[PDB]
């Protein structure tokens, strides 16, 4: 979840 | 190690 986060930003 | 790779490319 947390690099989903960070990839969509 | 896998998703080391996977992260890499």
């Known amino acids: 979840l947390a690099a ?3 990839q969509a930003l």
Do not use: S
């Open 4 to 6: 989903c986060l960070a």
